[PDB]
Amino acid sequence: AYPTVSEIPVGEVRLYQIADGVWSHIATQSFDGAVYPSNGLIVRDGDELLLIDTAWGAKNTAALLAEIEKQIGLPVTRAVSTHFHDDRVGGVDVLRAAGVATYASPSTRRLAEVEGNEIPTHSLEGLSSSGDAVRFGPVELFYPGAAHSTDNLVVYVPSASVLYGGCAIYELSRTSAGNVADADLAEWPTSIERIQQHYPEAQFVIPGHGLPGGLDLLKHTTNVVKAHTNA
Ligand SMILES: C=C(C[C@H]1O[B-](O)(O)c2cc(OC3CNC3)ccc21)C(=O)O
Ligand SMILES: [Zn+2]
Ligand SMILES: [Zn+2]
């Protein structure tokens, strides 16, 4: 049964196992008078743990490393940040403090620094053009073009057909868009096209916020975006 925002006090972290060596991490934060849940990904790489995205905060993130060790017992050696907002790079300093080599594209690094956000240590090359992909450990990394933001990346685990969309992918119950001051709404469904074509087998699909689903979510997300747009 997946955790929900109301089960997670602010500053605490949960883990949810999706498939052998594949988990999502969940945390909750305040963003103007309300508290929201946020998702991330953890994939086993043998003796070591690959992190996708922070827990939204230097504090939540210290609590993410705690629950990983308690519940998994392995060491996080590399983390990838899917885009440049604070639910994705916030916590990257704690991470580096505690031993992690932290990676994100050069677009992400440059945008985080202009914004006033924390900055990943190492550049990810091979993701500068729509449809580019690169292997990185036990996952694949995919830049499908502009959408939620100009630099957003998704992450596929072939060993288990888990597809992680980040904030470019909405959950089923979300019926309005909300936050888009950095989206490319026009380009966004063309970018979901590329994801659908590129991973049409995916059994599991994880959104930046909320409840997991399947490829249904790609259609569901395409629809919400074209509604915002027609109004
Ligand atoms: C739930 C959300 C908001 C969530 O999406 B996001 O672009 O990853 C993000 C950034 C963010 O940064 C703050 C720190 N200063 C502005 C805060 C919240 C979000 C949604 O549905 O989109
Ligand atoms: Zn964002
Ligand atoms: Zn988000």
Kindly indicate whether the domain formed by 5-230 is annotated with CATH number 3.60.15.10: yes
Q: Which three-class secondary structure state does DSSP give residue 202?
A: coil
Q: Is 179 in the active site?
A: yes
Among 206, 87, 191, 100, smallest CA distance to 142 is for 191
Please name which of 140, 111, 145, 116 lies closest in space to residue 128, comparing C-alpha atoms.
Answer: 145
Query: Which method, experimentally, gave rise to this model?
Result: X-ray
> Is 209 marked active-site?
no
Q: To one decimal place, what's the resolution in Å? A: 2.5
The residue extents of the domains of the chain are 5-230
| Options 25, 60, 83, 117, the catalytic residue | 83
Pairing outcome for strands 154-157 and 162-166? antiparallel
Please say if 86 is a catalytic residue: no
Spatial CB neighbours of 83, under 8 Å, sequence gap ≥ 6: 108, 148, 149, 151, 152, 153, 166, 167
Q: Tell which atom from ligand 1 comes closest to the C-alpha of 208.
A: 8
- The rounded distance, in Å, linking the Cα atoms of 41 and 200 is 20
Contacts 24+ apart (CB under 8 A), 129-138: 130/191, 130/194, 131/194, 131/198, 133/198, 136/80, 136/103, 137/43, 137/45, 137/50, 137/78, 138/21, 138/43, 138/44, 138/45, 138/50
Q: Give the residue, by CA position, lying nearest to ligand 1 atom 10.
A: 85
Angstrom distances, CA of residue 183 to CA of 46, 47, 101, 103:
36, 38, 28, 22
Residues around ion ligand 2, judged by CB within 5 A, are 85, 167
Of 25, 53, 87, 209, which is the active-site residue?
A: 87
